Amino acid sequence: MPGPAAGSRARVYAEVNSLRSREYWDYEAHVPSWGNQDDYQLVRKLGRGKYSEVFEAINITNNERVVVKILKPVKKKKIKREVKILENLRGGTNIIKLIDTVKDPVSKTPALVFEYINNTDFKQLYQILTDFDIRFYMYELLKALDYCHSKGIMHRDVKPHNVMIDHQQKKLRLIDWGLAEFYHPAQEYNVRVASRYFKGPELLVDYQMYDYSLDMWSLGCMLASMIFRREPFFHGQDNYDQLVRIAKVLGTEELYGYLKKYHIDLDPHFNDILGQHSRKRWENFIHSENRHLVSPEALDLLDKLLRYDHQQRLTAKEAMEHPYFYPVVKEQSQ
Numbered sequence: 001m002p003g004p005a006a007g008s009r010a011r012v013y014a015e016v017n018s019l020r021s022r023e024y025w026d027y028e029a030h031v032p033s034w035g036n037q038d039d040y041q042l043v044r045k046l047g048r049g050k051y052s053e054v055f056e057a058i059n060i061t062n063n064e065r066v067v068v069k070i071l072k073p074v075k076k077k078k079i080k081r082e083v084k085i086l087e088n089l090r091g092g093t094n095i096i097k098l099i100d101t102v103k104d105p106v107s108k109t110p111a112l113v114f115e116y117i118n119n120t121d122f123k124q125l126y127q128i129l130t131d132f133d134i135r136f137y138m139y140e141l142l143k144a145l146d147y148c149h150s151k152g153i154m155h156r157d158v159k160p161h162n163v164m165i166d167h168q169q170k171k172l173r174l175i176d177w178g179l180a181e182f183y184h185p186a187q188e189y190n191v192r193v194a195s196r197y198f199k200g201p202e203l204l205v206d207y208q209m210y211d212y213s214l215d216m217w218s219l220g221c222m223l224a225s226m227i228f229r230r231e232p233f234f235h236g237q238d239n240y241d242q243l244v245r246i247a248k249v250l251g252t253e254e255l256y257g258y259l260k261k262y263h264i265d266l267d268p269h270f271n272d273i274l275g276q277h278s279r280k281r282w283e284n285f286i287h288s289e290n291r292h293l294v295s296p297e298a299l300d301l302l303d304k305l306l307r308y309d310h311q312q313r314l315t316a317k318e319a320m321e322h323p324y325f326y327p328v329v330k331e332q333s334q
């Protein structure tokens, strides 16, 4: 309509799924097999969301501790898909492992039996960390991101509560994948995904032509909080204040340029809201309280991540080939 808008495309795996069997991305056509519950004794309920309840369980057959989740047939679509995706991920570094899709004849409803990892909530955890114990998980976390990205998939919801971490042992597993989806070269994607603290700026202007990049802003948000000490860093209010909380960091001007870059009329409102703020040196957040966590690296890596242009951001991999993570000879030396 008068006032066209280019659009975007994945800058990295922009065409992956295509050069692939339809079977693959056609999850609406994915009829997975199921198992009973009976084989599983749901010990203690860890959590649950709007559609899924989540318990700690153990496979009766072989006293093996495991995690299980269930969720009414809200949209056999989501369900259908969530499954295909996960099978399509299994065997992926730091990617939650889907043990087996079973339908607890309990209600005669489907459930997932995920591997079990001993999570310790970032709340307590995100404070004992260290310049090291951070680069370490980020990178780790990343290895996950880049992998699902490499496989044409953008989780669509990055946040602490989806990033378990066994600090004792020392492992990371980006659990969950119920909001994720497939990435095909240009497709208006609901913008109503993610959380009111990570949802990227892009998903504020209701800009659907997003991609893997989204998985990075989030990843961006954590890092900052992890490095500076704010949780969340952009602790927003109205799904709209969440745009200003940012605006004050990336810049009000710098912002428009972005919406100019992609023909975007900023919904009214923000007018009264926004104001005229100017990009803030990330140093404007480094005080005693976090002095030891920061460093030029994180500030560097951080600037190239938390950016408006949902395109000009570091890639899932580039991230890993970035300096800040050098401190990790990534156990693999060859």
Ligand SMILES: CC(C)Nc1ccc2cnn(-c3cncc(-n4ccc(CC(=O)O)c4)n3)c2c1
Binding pocket: 046, 047, 048, 054, 067, 069, 096, 114, 115, 116, 117, 118, 119, 161, 164, 175, 176, 177, 178
């Ligand atoms: C349940 C999630 C939302 N949060 C949560 C909250 C408290 C806790 C405590 N431990 N814990 C936990 C531990 N191991 C595995 C999973 N798990 C395996 C897959 C999924 C869920 C999935 O992958 O969808 C979760 N969750 C929690 C996990």
